[PDB]
């Protein structure tokens, strides 16, 4: 009998290691990447239900992963909580043993499905990569590992993560130089339409703040919504970072990930600075302080690389001993059954 403590403090008991997991929010702070990192090639042997998060919102990852692990595409598909695609009876019919639910999804889960999961004898384990707190990441990794009977490997993953995030957070706390001002934008809409920016305590804005930056939008944006173009010209930030990802329906969107090349990513980033009124004259553009990181890297088991990228971008000389791309690659090399490739970070020429 395995006793697991989840990220909220719930004591959850399994009769034996989980081997019929139902996935939610794969590639988005759900357990998928953690499970793959723990199980390696044996990943499909513990999954009873596959969500459609990767297929629908991260298709480049879905193609890459299924190419190397075709059994993933053979696992019965389940809906997503909070969509009208989730069917509790269909899930129960898979005879699963555990479902991992992100805290950001907990309220909806408890309202819509948990009573039905409980009635069927299915265990719930809450995890929370979205908090971006060291203890929450550690406890999440530890809970998923213990559920799977992979406590030792979970310990390696936790230490890998912990080594890197603590180096960043400790060093940042001891830097007393002025904080660089930063404008943050999800580059999903391309140069011609502003994507969402951030407050100082949400998502990319929270991460940038922890990494020692002054988020210029911290007071003007409540959570994540776009800023008025004139705001950026007036603030004239030290640094601009445009987030990239796989957005094939937006051909001018900033492109990063498995379907990305160096030349293309450079041209897409540069277009933001050339197509936007006044950007050519921006301090950030003139001084070549325009960067890009992959939007899908935060709130995940491998997001230590994001902590490193932000801190190294804001404080280059204080972080010469840190290599954020090597950290991501090493996470893949060490733990994941999928080959590393693609482009995940970028500095505009």
XYZ file of C-alpha atoms in Angstrom:
349
model
C 0.000 0.000 0.000
C 1.527 3.310 -1.108
C 0.772 6.505 0.793
C 1.204 9.658 -1.278
C 0.971 13.252 -0.081
C -0.209 15.506 -2.894
C 0.627 19.180 -3.467
C -2.386 20.299 -1.368
C -1.551 18.034 1.559
C -4.045 15.269 0.754
C -3.135 11.785 1.898
C -3.823 9.482 -1.044
C -3.470 5.695 -0.837
C -2.812 3.274 -3.716
C -2.904 -0.525 -3.434
C 0.046 -0.791 -5.845
C 1.946 1.449 -8.295
C -0.329 3.234 -10.800
C -0.410 1.636 -14.249
C -3.694 2.952 -15.656
C -3.345 6.736 -15.504
C -5.816 9.146 -17.180
C -3.911 12.196 -18.461
C -5.098 15.800 -18.347
C -3.387 18.979 -19.642
C -0.542 17.107 -21.379
C 2.317 19.464 -22.199
C 0.613 22.138 -20.104
C 1.405 21.395 -16.466
C -0.418 18.069 -16.357
C 1.668 14.982 -15.516
C 2.563 13.896 -19.107
C 6.138 15.212 -19.262
C 6.821 14.117 -15.677
C 5.467 10.635 -16.374
C 7.546 10.358 -19.565
C 10.626 11.470 -17.629
C 9.980 8.798 -14.979
C 8.984 5.892 -17.226
C 11.092 6.535 -20.327
C 10.355 3.915 -22.985
C 7.806 2.276 -20.660
C 5.620 5.402 -20.712
C 2.716 3.893 -22.697
C 2.520 0.911 -20.293
C 1.075 3.078 -17.486
C -1.367 5.294 -19.412
C -5.010 4.166 -19.733
C -6.424 7.414 -21.146
C -4.794 10.021 -23.369
C -6.109 13.603 -23.453
C -6.083 15.703 -26.646
C -4.128 18.676 -25.293
C -0.961 17.846 -27.276
C -2.864 16.938 -30.460
C -4.937 20.140 -30.363
C -2.632 22.806 -28.930
C 0.902 21.464 -29.314
C 0.680 19.437 -32.520
C 4.367 19.757 -33.335
C 5.167 17.945 -30.085
C 2.462 15.351 -30.815
C 4.001 14.556 -34.226
C 7.512 14.326 -32.819
C 6.551 12.186 -29.841
C 4.275 9.818 -31.780
C 6.939 9.415 -34.462
C 9.353 8.092 -31.844
C 6.744 6.380 -29.637
C 3.850 5.357 -31.945
C 2.048 3.498 -29.149
C 0.998 6.887 -27.771
C -1.480 7.293 -30.640
C -3.047 3.904 -29.817
C -4.097 4.815 -26.259
C -7.868 5.426 -25.878
C -8.620 9.164 -26.054
C -10.437 11.012 -23.226
C -12.013 14.466 -23.070
C -10.638 17.394 -21.079
C -12.170 18.634 -17.788
C -13.874 21.989 -18.323
C -14.579 21.224 -21.947
C -17.877 19.717 -23.022
C -15.698 16.887 -24.361
C -15.131 15.287 -20.950
C -17.381 12.274 -20.421
C -17.042 10.817 -16.922
C -18.656 7.488 -17.863
C -16.228 7.054 -20.786
C -13.305 7.610 -18.436
C -14.656 5.253 -15.733
C -15.005 2.652 -18.487
C -11.220 2.678 -18.917
C -10.848 1.278 -15.373
C -8.156 3.808 -14.485
C -6.408 3.805 -11.124
C -5.252 7.415 -10.808
C -5.821 10.816 -12.388
C -3.383 13.688 -11.770
C -5.075 17.088 -11.697
C -3.330 20.459 -11.744
C -4.444 22.811 -8.949
C -5.478 25.356 -11.608
C -7.928 22.673 -12.806
C -8.981 21.483 -9.296
C -12.100 23.641 -8.831
C -13.559 22.575 -12.175
C -12.571 18.941 -11.589
C -14.200 18.838 -8.154
C -17.344 20.473 -9.515
C -17.767 18.352 -12.652
C -16.220 14.883 -12.228
C -14.549 14.079 -8.875
C -17.691 12.661 -7.230
C -17.951 10.275 -10.183
C -14.253 9.403 -9.987
C -14.608 8.782 -6.222
C -17.701 6.612 -6.727
C -15.724 4.473 -9.206
C -12.765 4.018 -6.845
C -10.382 6.151 -8.916
C -7.760 8.108 -6.941
C -7.107 11.826 -7.424
C -3.615 13.311 -6.956
C -3.249 17.115 -7.162
C -0.062 18.608 -8.629
C 0.948 22.226 -9.243
C 3.630 23.386 -11.633
C 1.673 26.606 -12.294
C 2.561 28.108 -8.910
C 6.217 28.250 -9.965
C 7.315 27.647 -6.370
C 10.208 25.305 -5.634
C 8.317 23.326 -2.968
C 5.292 22.819 -5.264
C 7.478 21.526 -8.094
C 9.368 19.231 -5.711
C 6.197 17.898 -4.111
C 4.561 17.430 -7.521
C 7.525 15.488 -8.911
C 7.709 13.462 -5.698
C 3.971 12.621 -5.714
C 3.916 11.482 -9.364
C 7.057 9.407 -8.845
C 5.767 7.711 -5.704
C 2.436 6.969 -7.412
C 4.340 5.260 -10.239
C 6.773 3.359 -8.012
C 9.671 5.479 -9.304
C 10.757 7.303 -6.124
C 14.490 7.212 -6.868
C 14.181 8.605 -10.412
C 11.752 11.211 -9.118
C 14.517 12.199 -6.658
C 16.976 12.653 -9.560
C 14.502 14.828 -11.448
C 13.749 16.915 -8.343
C 17.452 17.461 -7.666
C 18.102 18.349 -11.315
C 15.354 20.957 -11.066
C 16.371 22.125 -7.595
C 20.109 22.511 -8.387
C 19.235 24.964 -11.150
C 16.339 26.991 -9.804
C 18.044 27.584 -6.431
C 21.251 28.798 -8.114
C 19.122 31.335 -10.011
C 16.911 32.444 -7.111
C 19.797 32.694 -4.624
C 22.030 34.645 -6.973
C 19.197 37.002 -8.025
C 18.497 37.797 -4.361
C 22.101 38.942 -3.928
C 22.268 41.150 -7.025
C 21.824 44.781 -5.928
C 22.299 46.454 -9.366
C 19.325 48.248 -10.915
C 16.714 45.883 -12.362
C 16.353 45.987 -16.132
C 12.914 47.029 -17.340
C 11.293 44.433 -19.584
C 8.332 44.331 -21.967
C 6.884 40.807 -22.278
C 4.556 39.668 -25.055
C 3.151 36.376 -26.332
C 3.924 36.671 -30.041
C 0.901 34.632 -31.147
C -0.632 37.327 -33.331
C 2.513 38.415 -35.184
C 3.856 41.981 -35.605
C 0.529 43.406 -36.846
C -1.492 42.682 -33.667
C -0.290 42.797 -30.047
C -0.455 39.542 -28.144
C -1.062 39.304 -24.401
C 1.305 40.984 -21.957
C 1.511 40.304 -18.225
C 1.167 41.676 -14.682
C 4.172 41.314 -12.376
C 2.692 38.300 -10.579
C 1.161 36.127 -13.314
C 2.814 33.585 -15.632
C 5.749 35.086 -17.592
C 5.355 38.253 -15.525
C 5.771 36.320 -12.280
C 8.799 34.458 -13.631
C 10.449 37.651 -14.908
C 9.955 39.286 -11.505
C 11.483 36.298 -9.675
C 14.444 36.438 -12.061
C 15.090 40.051 -11.069
C 13.399 42.147 -13.766
C 11.147 45.209 -13.574
C 8.051 44.227 -15.598
C 6.924 47.500 -17.249
C 3.315 46.264 -17.486
C 3.076 45.105 -13.828
C 0.625 47.902 -12.871
C -1.325 48.296 -16.132
C -2.240 44.660 -16.863
C -4.276 42.768 -14.245
C -3.387 39.213 -15.324
C -2.714 38.642 -19.030
C -4.187 40.909 -21.697
C -2.674 43.028 -24.419
C -1.167 46.457 -23.696
C -1.725 49.600 -25.780
C 1.134 50.026 -28.332
C 1.787 53.600 -27.113
C 2.639 52.281 -23.636
C 5.726 50.475 -24.968
C 7.048 53.526 -26.853
C 6.704 55.720 -23.741
C 8.307 53.228 -21.356
C 11.170 52.452 -23.765
C 12.097 49.235 -21.942
C 15.686 47.984 -21.518
C 14.672 44.539 -22.791
C 11.881 43.108 -24.995
C 11.005 39.408 -25.013
C 8.481 37.998 -27.506
C 7.236 34.481 -26.687
C 7.218 31.931 -29.519
C 5.457 28.614 -30.066
C 3.757 26.462 -32.679
C 0.900 28.566 -34.117
C 0.452 27.305 -37.715
C -2.775 29.289 -38.215
C -0.820 32.492 -37.568
C 1.887 32.571 -40.262
C 3.575 35.717 -38.885
C 3.518 34.476 -35.280
C 6.867 34.014 -33.527
C 7.867 30.398 -34.208
C 9.731 28.203 -31.708
C 9.658 24.475 -30.887
C 10.229 21.317 -32.952
C 9.128 22.955 -36.204
C 11.477 25.902 -36.129
C 14.755 26.841 -37.766
C 17.341 29.432 -36.719
C 16.900 31.534 -39.891
C 13.094 31.520 -39.727
C 12.957 32.340 -36.017
C 15.379 35.240 -36.595
C 13.277 36.656 -39.421
C 10.003 36.276 -37.495
C 11.484 38.038 -34.435
C 13.064 40.811 -36.510
C 9.725 41.455 -38.238
C 8.210 42.469 -34.879
C 10.796 45.283 -34.663
C 10.509 46.391 -38.307
C 6.734 46.242 -38.870
C 5.699 48.031 -35.652
C 5.446 51.831 -35.545
C 8.379 53.354 -33.669
C 9.986 50.044 -32.644
C 13.021 50.751 -34.862
C 13.818 53.631 -32.512
C 13.279 51.629 -29.320
C 16.225 51.417 -26.930
C 15.675 47.635 -26.768
C 15.874 47.267 -30.558
C 18.836 49.624 -31.016
C 20.869 47.867 -28.295
C 19.929 44.405 -29.568
C 18.068 43.533 -26.376
C 15.270 41.627 -28.122
C 14.819 37.994 -27.060
C 12.359 35.111 -27.373
C 11.603 32.031 -25.259
C 9.137 29.202 -25.954
C 5.658 29.884 -24.464
C 5.117 26.217 -23.592
C 8.183 25.799 -21.398
C 6.825 27.354 -18.148
C 4.572 25.591 -15.601
C 6.362 22.315 -16.369
C 8.800 19.805 -14.938
C 11.555 21.130 -17.225
C 10.926 24.867 -16.597
C 14.200 25.310 -14.687
C 15.543 26.234 -18.123
C 13.151 29.201 -18.201
C 14.341 30.426 -14.793
C 17.903 30.248 -16.141
C 17.060 31.939 -19.459
C 15.328 34.882 -17.804
C 18.069 35.458 -15.204
C 20.873 35.086 -17.753
C 19.052 37.465 -20.149
C 18.543 40.105 -17.464
C 22.000 39.649 -15.876
C 24.410 38.206 -18.522
C 27.703 38.707 -16.660
C 26.319 37.249 -13.418
C 25.256 34.056 -15.200
C 28.143 33.055 -17.506
C 28.208 29.677 -15.766
C 24.611 28.967 -16.788
C 23.463 27.580 -20.173
C 19.647 27.449 -20.457
C 19.643 25.646 -23.810
C 22.022 23.005 -22.441
C 19.710 22.598 -19.417
C 16.688 21.837 -21.618
C 18.719 19.505 -23.864
C 20.144 17.754 -20.801
C 16.660 17.245 -19.332
C 15.711 15.507 -22.584
C 18.987 13.539 -22.827
C 18.803 12.374 -19.195
C 15.094 11.627 -18.655
C 12.876 11.820 -21.747
C 12.250 9.008 -24.266
C 11.943 11.673 -26.997
C 14.943 13.093 -28.883
C 15.889 16.716 -28.315
C 15.749 19.103 -31.306
C 14.209 22.372 -32.511
C 14.668 25.960 -31.279
C 13.515 27.102 -27.831
C 15.374 30.337 -27.121
C 16.495 33.183 -29.328
C 18.437 36.417 -29.332
C 17.708 38.651 -32.303
C 20.745 39.498 -34.412
